[PDB]
Amino acid sequence: KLPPGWEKRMFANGTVYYFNHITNASQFERPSG
């Protein structure tokens, strides 16, 4: 799946994003998934 800490999530405007739960980083750019 996604690299260390990265987890697929979703935003109130109706879109998917990615959150890194080990660093608190957040991106739309899909980290290998």
Instruction: State the residue for tokens 């996604």.
Output: 2
Q: Where are the domains of the chain?
A: 1-33
Look up the CATH number of domain 1-33: 2.20.70.10
DSSP string, 1-33: --STTEEEEEETTTEEEEEETTTTEEESS-S--
Alpha carbons within 13 angstroms on the beta-carbon side of residue 8 total 7
Query: What type of residue sits at position 30?
Result: R
